[PDB]
Ligand binder design. Structure first.
Ligand SMILES: [Mg+2]
Ligand SMILES: [Mg+2]
Ligand SMILES: [Mg+2]
Ligand SMILES: [Mg+2]
Ligand SMILES: [Mg+2]
Ligand SMILES: [Mg+2]
Ligand SMILES: [Mg+2]
Ligand SMILES: [Mg+2]
Ligand SMILES: [Mg+2]
Ligand SMILES: [Mg+2]
Ligand SMILES: [Zn+2]
Lengths: 71, 129, 139, 55, 102, 144, 139
RNA sequence: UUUCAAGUCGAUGGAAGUUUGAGGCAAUAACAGGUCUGUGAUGCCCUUAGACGUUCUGGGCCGCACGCGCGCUACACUGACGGAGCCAGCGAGUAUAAGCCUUGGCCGAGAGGUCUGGGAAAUCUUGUGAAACUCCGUCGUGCUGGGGAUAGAGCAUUGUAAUUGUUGCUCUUCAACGAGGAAUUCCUAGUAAGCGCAAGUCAUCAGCUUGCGUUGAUUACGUCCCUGCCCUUUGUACACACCG
């Protein structure tokens, strides 16, 4: 029943930048769980959001990415 | 998928084994023929042919020479069922022991490259009920 | 600074970048086709760079030891094969890939055929590897 | 003629290629350290050979 | 064929005769002013054979575990070859075999 | 190396060699649905066609799709090794081939009658649906 | 000069520590301790350091060679060789009052810093795949 | 605590305080338990030249509507792959053979081939650079990149001989299985569980045993409730002893 979205359109993209900052804790599963996007799409979003400064890296690991809001 | 091509032509079909048709197939020396078949056959001929396979070929050759009205070439019987069928012996009929009886097989051209005893099953099939 | 004073994992990522950017390493034509080991089931995921990274590992691995052969390199990078229903087993890596790397590396430098077997590191091999270690740790 | 057939099959690299020193059996042979003895003949000669049970 | 660094290799199953011959040779290499190296205790080899107890194939799966320990010692002497060989005949023992290599 | 967006270019369902392919699967593993195309084979045709593996099936353009189906139909012309092929040293013409979706079962069948026509032992057991490679059947393969 | 050599052991792993007088060099098989590959266990070898304070290692340099055992078993052998080497150096070249002080903090935190674990693998017995495990029985 | 006895439970010291851990040996008798398919160990019976002796050739012991037992892979994300990191121990090893362990170099995508050299061995294979494992990536809950049966085609090794594929490798084919009812097994510390490696069988073949080491726990440290055995009392018309 999952049918998670793997292609990023524009409606979801700006919705992401409007919703991810208002999260206590973001991770690979959090993006999948609440944004309905796929796991692979979640991983690329986290690696860019850190470069754009919106997201602060709490911990770095291959199997787990622990991130938090930067404000 | 680009498209869907389906032409085909009637090239006067004749049996062919790995690119060599029946006409040329029959007149190949077994040394040249083995160079275009499987790995197991190629290994066997390099390991050295003992006297038993070579003796059977001579008798199979003679059995064909026995009849020249062009009917079946009479049967040579043998136990050596590890014999590899070669184009030279196409059309000959051999009786291959399966442990009890002389199963009779006719060497069809499509049988080439197989073991001679592979066409004489050694066990009667199971039948429950 | 020496090779032993820098972490191995991020040193190879730095030596791999240099060997690719240097471009002098001769890459065999089958690197986009072959699998590293008979125990593997798929080719490497980093098609463009896997050969460079493996050569960096071979060069670094030879630095810390003495006369390692090419047969030993197959055992080192080999892993457990996934036999279907039979238990797992260790299987050696491909011989050609390891032999080509050290041969490709021998005319680009760092190594040479050592006495009493194996492949020693070259007079210049210590000079330029220790260099890479320095350009690894400034950040 | 007959001499070329009698005992003509090769009897090397096989289980029938070797036999027990003692009973000339073919099954349960021990080849370690060149013993070439059946496992039953070994037990009745182990003390004589110099094999003892310690652990 | 005068002075010669000569190695004597001692192997046996039992250690008492091995150490008696080893000590007796070392002792004889003391009163004779001969510089010596040894004895060197080589790592002992445990020859283990594990068979089934049953001559037939019935019962609980019980196994014997036979053993044959082999101990090897080498002693280095600096003496002429005539001198070393006669020391061997002095310390001859039925259990221990001797091989002499130059 | 960053998240990108597109509109109307993605294709949810592809049709290659008369087989329907889901467009949201990664290209290397989407092609494995085509019978005769395994994971190992799909990795090479994408790399020979200069199609980077980080793309979903629907992301591909028509130019790339035709370039892939062209390579699969002519593997030897693109430095694909003979030993890497599906059907090498073919029975009738002796050349190295790689049979695909609507051709594999045809030549697999033709091999079965070719075994059954000569009445080989392997062909007979294939007819019964039993194991032909000597596996024991005393205690295994009892389903239907 | 003032040199003492010691060793620590785990199941099979044995780490030989050489403690010489110097500037404070602390290496693992010729590599700094800051780069041990059991990253999750890097603080196991950091424990003998931060417990007493790094000022104790100003005058001594330590070079260990650890062989045998496994990845984890080697870490416990290394940390024991370091802890025992520091104590053995103080007993021989410093007053024994300081040596008893250092030995107190280590033991009060973890006994394995100074005392080798005596556990070894139990032999396997026939009738089962393990030391105590047995083949499944049927009636 | 205790009959202040035998002991038991806690600490301290200690390498070790469960008989220090683990085994080897192991009583008085006994079983119609299993083996004459280990014996040039055997009594008797059968056969002994058209052999039931021995040998050659080929097949079978693998044969398949089915029930059961010892096991191996798995059913996934505490994971699969792809790279990178890279640590053991127990052992074995040959000559004019009938061919041992085989590094190093050179060919091959692999399996493997070839040329030299070391080792009758703490010397060389070998630090057996093993696998789980760790790091960085791809995958993203999908019978999916889990799983790898079944099968087609091709390439090598051993062997006189591979067909009923010995085994290995390449591509393709990618099935049940989505954690398993009634029942039932093993186990208390470097133990269980994984994870590999060596030796035996072995020309070739280990999903098997015998050991070894790597990672390494949860939970009792109690009871006779189930089950088996031992002891005492008891009944007996049994003593070939309840298979009476
Ligand atoms: Mg069409
Ligand atoms: Mg090798
Ligand atoms: Mg690896
Ligand atoms: Mg037939
Ligand atoms: Mg107990
Ligand atoms: Mg026979
Ligand atoms: Mg059992
Ligand atoms: Mg991995
Ligand atoms: Mg051989
Ligand atoms: Mg009770
Ligand atoms: Zn015997």
């Amino acid at each position: 029943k999952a049918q998670h979205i793997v292609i990023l359109d524009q409606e979801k993209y700006d919705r992401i930048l409007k919703d991810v900052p208002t999260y206590k804790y973001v991770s690979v599963s959090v993006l999948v769980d609440r944004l309905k996007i796929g796991g692979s799409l979640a991983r690329v979003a986290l690696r860019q959001l850190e470069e754009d400064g919106i997201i602060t890296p709490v911990l770095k690991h291959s199997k787990q990415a622990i991130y938090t809001r930067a404000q | 998928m680009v498209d869907a091509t389906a032409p085909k032509k009637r090239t006067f079909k004749q049996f062919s084994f790995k690119g060599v048709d029946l006409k040329d197939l029959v007149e190949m020396p077994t040394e040249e023929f083995t160079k275009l078949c499987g790995a197991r056959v190629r290994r066997r001929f390099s390991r050295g042919l003992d006297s038993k396979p070579m003796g059977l070929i001579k008798k199979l050759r003679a059995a064909r020479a026995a009849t020249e009205p062009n009917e079946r070439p009479a049967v040579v019987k043998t136990h050596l069922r590890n014999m590899i069928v070669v184009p030279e012996m196409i059309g000959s009929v051999v009786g291959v022991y399966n442990g009890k009886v002389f199963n009779t097989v006719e060497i069809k051209p499509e049988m080439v490259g197989h073991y001679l005893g592979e066409f004489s099953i050694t066990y009667t099939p199971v039948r429950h009920g | 600074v020496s090779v032993r004073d820098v972490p191995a994992q991020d040193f190879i990522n730095a030596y791999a970048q240099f060997l690719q950017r240097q471009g002098k390493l001769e890459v065999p034509g089958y690197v986009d086709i072959v699998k590293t080991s008979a125990g593997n089931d798929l080719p490497p995921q980093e098609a463009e760079t896997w050969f460079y990274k493996r050569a960096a590992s071979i060069a670094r691995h030879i630095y810390l030891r003495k006369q390692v052969g090419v047969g030993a390199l197959n055992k080192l990078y080999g892993g457990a094969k996934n036999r279907g229903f039979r238990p797992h087993k260790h299987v050696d890596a491909s011989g050609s890939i390891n032999r080509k790397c050290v041969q490709a590396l021998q005319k680009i430098g760092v190594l040479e055929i050592s006495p009493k077997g194996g492949r020693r590191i070259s007079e210049n091999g210590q000079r330029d590897l220790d260099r890479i270690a320095a350009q690894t740790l400034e950040e | 003629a007959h001499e070329n057939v009698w005992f003509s099959h090769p009897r090397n690299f096989g289980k029938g290629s070797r036999q027990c020193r003692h009973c000339s059996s073919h099954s349960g042979l021990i080849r370690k350290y060149g013993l070439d003895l059946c496992r039953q003949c070994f037990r009745e000669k182990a003390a004589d050979i110099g094999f003892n049970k310690y652990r | 064929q005068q002075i010669h660094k000569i190695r004597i290799t001692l192997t046996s199953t039992k250690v008492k005769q091995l150490e008696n011959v080893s000590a007796n040779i070392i002792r004889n290499a003391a009163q004779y002013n001969i510089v010596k190296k040894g004895p060197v205790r080589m790592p002992t080899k445990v020859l283990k054979i594990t068979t089934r107890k049953t001559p037939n194939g019935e019962g609980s799966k019980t196994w014997d575990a036979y053993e044959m320990r082999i101990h090897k010692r080498v002693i280095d002497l600096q003496a002429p070859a005539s001198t070393v060989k006669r020391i061997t005949q002095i310390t001859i023992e039925p259990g221990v075999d001797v091989e002499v290599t130059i | 190396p960053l998240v990108v967006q597109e509109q109307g270019s993605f294709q949810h369902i592809l049709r290659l060699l008369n087989t329907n392919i889901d467009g949201r699967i990664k290209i290397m593993y989407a092609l494995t649905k085509i019978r005769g195309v395994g994971r190992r084979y799909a990795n090479l045709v994408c790399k020979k066609a200069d199609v980077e593996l980080t793309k979903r099936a629907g992301e591909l353009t028509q130019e790339e799709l035709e370039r892939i189906v062209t390579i699969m139909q002519n593997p030897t012309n693109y430095k694909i090794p003979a030993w890497f092929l599906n059907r090498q040293k073919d029975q009738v013409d002796g050349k190295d081939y790689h049979v695909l979706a609507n051709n594999l079962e045809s030549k697999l069948r033709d091999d079965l009658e070719r075994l059954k026509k000569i009445r080989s032992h392997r062909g007979i057991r294939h007819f019964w649906g039993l194991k032909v490679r000597g596996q024991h059947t005393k205690t295994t393969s009892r389903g239907r | 000069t003032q040199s003492v050599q010691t060793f620590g052991k785990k199941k099979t792993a044995t780490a030989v520590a050489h403690v010489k007088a110097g500037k404070g060099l602390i290496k693992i098989n010729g590599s700094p301790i800051t780069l041990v590959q059991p990253e999750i266990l890097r603080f196991k070898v950091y424990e003998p350091l931060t417990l007493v304070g790094l000022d104790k290692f100003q005058g001594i340099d330590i070079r260990v060679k650890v062989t045998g055992g496994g990845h984890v078993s080697q870490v416990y052998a290394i940390r024991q060789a370091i802890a025992k080497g520091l104590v053995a150096y103080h007993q021989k070249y410093v007053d024994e009052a300081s040596k008893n002080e250092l030995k107190k903090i280590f033991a009060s935190y973890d006994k394995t810093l100074l005392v080798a674990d005596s556990r070894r693998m139990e032999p396997k017995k026939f009738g089962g795949r393990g030391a105590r495990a047995r083949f499944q029985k049927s009636y």
